[PDB]
Amino acid sequence: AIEVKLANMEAEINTLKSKLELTNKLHAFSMGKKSGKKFFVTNHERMPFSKVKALCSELRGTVAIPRNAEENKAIQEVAKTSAFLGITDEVTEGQFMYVTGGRLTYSNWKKDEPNDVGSGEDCVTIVDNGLWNDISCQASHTAVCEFPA
Amino acid sequence: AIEVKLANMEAEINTLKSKLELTNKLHAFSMGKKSGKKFFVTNHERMPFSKVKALCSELRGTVAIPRNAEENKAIQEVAKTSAFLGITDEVTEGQFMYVTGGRLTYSNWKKDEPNDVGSGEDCVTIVDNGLWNDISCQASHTAVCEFPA
Amino acid sequence: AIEVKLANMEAEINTLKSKLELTNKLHAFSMGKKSGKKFFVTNHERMPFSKVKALCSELRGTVAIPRNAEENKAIQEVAKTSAFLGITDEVTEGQFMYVTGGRLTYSNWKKDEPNDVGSGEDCVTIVDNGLWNDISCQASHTAVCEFPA
């Protein structure tokens, strides 16, 4: 009896795990995730980079990072307003790196940017037309997270 | 070994619990939930107050209640059209109360409202410009639910 | 110990099942699901019919099929642009059938359609009028999946 009950429960667990994964798939789809593409999403809340990072991490994602022009446009249409990207030049000034590791491949800087103005600007925001502007990490911008393809 | 399988099952259940909690958090975030703020959702369906209550209750939420101007604006944006609020004077005519209990504090009544017109109006709808009007609970208005912060 | 823990885990599993059902209801409501009505969802991606069937199949739904004018309008509004319907005449030219099986009840063909132009047209797209046109299954149109009422 006990070995049988346990086996049956193990089967119920497998089914439940698959059903949750399905729920996750349907949700991503409803929010616009394209086949074979990363899922970008926002709650339209503006906050400092430290909070965006903590927030996306809490949902098991990361701050949105455009790896090419196509993902840049995707993040642009999701954000609507100015949003932080998971890129900073905190280690060596001018050397932008992804918060998940590695040197910057694709970039879409605005005219006269990055300019590290004032006391300094080590974070990055995607703004109007999808162009980039380095900004203070302490400034508040829209939180956009990315989840794997 | 029975005991080893039971321990694995405890681990599988805990993992499931944590992933479902994550699914709930990601969904709220995608629906616009701001940090430390309750969030609002609607399917844009219009129905009598009693139905809205049942529906929200069934989702472990409650008909939306504006506790301040920010929340009121947020509800207004989600709704898009006239929607019921979790406020009524059903228990004692003239004394509006929250469906979850307590006398109404913050309010945003249109001029000359509430007016309990006709045979009476004991429900409340957020309408044009986000102002409020008491209306018959039997009329159909947009169902908007609120969930905890 | 053994038996008590097993009984607890059974209640844990049942509790999880109820919670996930709850999450699915909340998600459906946010996706726009109207009471007792089937609902349509899209990620706004355009792709060939085969990829639409595959994508909807993964999510345990089916390619959208309008059964009457009301459902046909619902699909139109969700898609916004041309979208494939779960209808084709791939089996027998001239004879449209549902992908779920069966001959065509409701139809909303644009004048002179279906015409199987040029090399051939075995799929159907609901256009920007709500009307239908048979088109190549290899063409890319918006993916709209359907879930039960």
Ligand SMILES: OC[C@H]1O[C@H](O[C@@H]2[C@H](O)[C@@H](O)O[C@H](CO)[C@H]2O)[C@@H](O)[C@@H](O)[C@@H]1O
């Ligand atoms: O110091 C912040 C930022 O200021 C300047 O850019 C302006 C801002 O991004 C914002 O206020 O919008 C303006 C356009 O409406 C934009 O010019 C630049 O000096 C920039 O380099 C700097 O990071």
Ligand SMILES: OC[C@H]1O[C@H](O[C@@H]2[C@H](O)[C@@H](O)O[C@H](CO)[C@H]2O)[C@@H](O)[C@@H](O)[C@@H]1O
């Ligand atoms: O905004 C005024 C009032 O409008 C609607 O009710 C109407 C009025 O009470 C009045 O003019 O009589 C009409 C029927 O003869 C009635 O429709 C409602 O929206 C009401 O709640 C509102 O206060």
Ligand SMILES: OC[C@H]1O[C@H](O[C@@H]2[C@H](O)[C@@H](O)O[C@H](CO)[C@H]2O)[C@@H](O)[C@@H](O)[C@@H]1O
């Ligand atoms: O609305 C008619 C027809 O339009 C589109 O196809 C075009 C026509 O078949 C025709 O004029 O020739 C064109 C190629 O030279 C062709 O694109 C399609 O929407 C078709 O399905 C429709 O029947």
Ligand SMILES: [Ca+2]
């Ligand atoms: Ca620096």
Ligand SMILES: [Ca+2]
């Ligand atoms: Ca810098």
Ligand SMILES: [Ca+2]
């Ligand atoms: Ca700058």
Ligand SMILES: [Ca+2]
């Ligand atoms: Ca009364």
Ligand SMILES: [Ca+2]
């Ligand atoms: Ca009254």
Ligand SMILES: [Ca+2]
């Ligand atoms: Ca009134």
Ligand SMILES: [Ca+2]
């Ligand atoms: Ca054919």
Ligand SMILES: [Ca+2]
């Ligand atoms: Ca054909």
Ligand SMILES: [Ca+2]
């Ligand atoms: Ca045609």
Ligand SMILES: [Cl-]
């Ligand atoms: Cl900075």
Ligand SMILES: [Cl-]
């Ligand atoms: Cl009433």
Ligand SMILES: [Cl-]
């Ligand atoms: Cl074809």
